[PDB]
């Protein structure tokens, strides 16, 4: 009979790191949450992935519907008039996948529409109706995702878009630190919940969609998307709650920005910009636009990283560096 050892086995309580995820809608917060699960937890099991099949189908249907309606508003004709019929069927069958089953009929409708020349002409003008950035991801792999045996891959789950109406808390561990991450997905909640969420914050991660720079101003806006993000970052960085908080800036969607800057001038977003329409200089300009909004004491600087939130290796690298920063400032 060997007496059992200690229950702590020589370990002790893990130090807590409270992270606040902030940023405009579609900036990459949910993707960062999922990447934290993939990198520092166990990823997504097969059952969890199965639970996202309905979301994948809904995202795909909603994306193609957005494109068709945008054709309506922009006066873009179908490449072939028969597609009109398909369009009608799309709206008739749009609720048929809510049980995680995409019939061959709906799959064929979506395939024919996505292949049409007018639909593609409208897609190339996505900046004019702010089409979500995962539409083509699913619509170009329709064949794979439309199989009766389809199970969403990890990358598939990463690209899904789900409602984030409140403040959601997730946990992980890394370098013996216990991370409590709070995604502020919504614009409203109870005052006491705001207080509980902003209390004792170790660090903020603020996500910015770079590729938002060329989005057309919609009727529900008073300024363009990038400037809404800048205003939010201003209100956060200079609030009493965060006078001494470590502020990290994820200038995200750098891949889409790299592709867009080739053909869309940054002056669409910043009319005063006189620099070149090239990746590095335009990226530096946006970075300075955001960093100049920090009016805290000089010791309180902003830690900026360029990210592709959907790229697991890049997020792993960037978060490895952010953890070192947090340990330093600890």
């Amino acid at each position: 009979l060997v007496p059992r050892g200690s229950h702590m086995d020589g370990e002790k309580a893990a130090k807590e790191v409270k992270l606040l995820l902030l940023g405009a809608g579609e900036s990459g917060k949910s993707t960062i949450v999922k990447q934290m699960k993939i990198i520092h937890e166990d990823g997504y099991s097969e059952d969890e992935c199965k639970q996202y099949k309905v979301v994948v189908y809904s995202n795909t249907i909603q994306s193609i519907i957005a494109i068709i309606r945008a054709m309506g508003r922009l006066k873009i004709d179908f490449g072939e008039a028969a597609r009109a019929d398909d369009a009608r069927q799309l709206f008739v069958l749009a609720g048929s996948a809510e049980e995680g089953v995409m019939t061959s009929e709906l799959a064929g409708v979506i395939k024919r529409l996505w292949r049409d020349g007018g639909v593609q002409a409208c897609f190339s003008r996505s900046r004019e109706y702010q089409l979500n950035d995962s539409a083509s991801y699913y619509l170009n792999d329709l064949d794979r995702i439309s199989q009766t045996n389809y199970i969403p891959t990890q990358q598939d789950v990463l690209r899904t878009r789900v409602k984030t109406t409140g403040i959601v808390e997730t946990h992980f561990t890394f370098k013996e630190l216990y991370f409590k991450m709070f995604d502020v997905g919504g614009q409203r909640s109870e005052r006491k919940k705001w207080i509980h969420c902003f209390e004792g914050v170790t660090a903020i991660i603020f996500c910015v969609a770079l590729s938002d720079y060329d989005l057309v101003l919609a009727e529900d806006e008073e300024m363009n998307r990038m400037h809404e993000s800048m205003k939010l970052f201003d209100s956060i960085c200079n609030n009493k709650w965060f006078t001494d908080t470590s502020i990290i800036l994820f200038l995200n969607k750098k891949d889409l920005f790299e592709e867009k800057i080739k053909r869309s001038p940054l002056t669409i977003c910043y009319p005063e910009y006189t620099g070149s329409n090239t990746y590095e200089e335009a990226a530096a300009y946006i970075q300075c636009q955001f960093e100049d909004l920090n009016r805290r004491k000089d010791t309180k600087e902003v830690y900026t990283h360029f990210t592709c939130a959907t790229d697991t290796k890049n997020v792993q690298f960037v978060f490895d560096a952010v953890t070192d920063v947090i340990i330093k400032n600890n």
């Binding site: 705001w194 009493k240 709650w241």
Partner: peptide, 18 residues
């Protein structure tokens, strides 16, 4: 600084916090 149960926007909360 009304009651803790009043649903409020992030902007309103940041404002009253300052």
């Amino acid at each position: 600084g009304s009651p803790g149960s009043e649903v409020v926007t992030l902007q309103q909360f940041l404002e009253e916090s300052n």
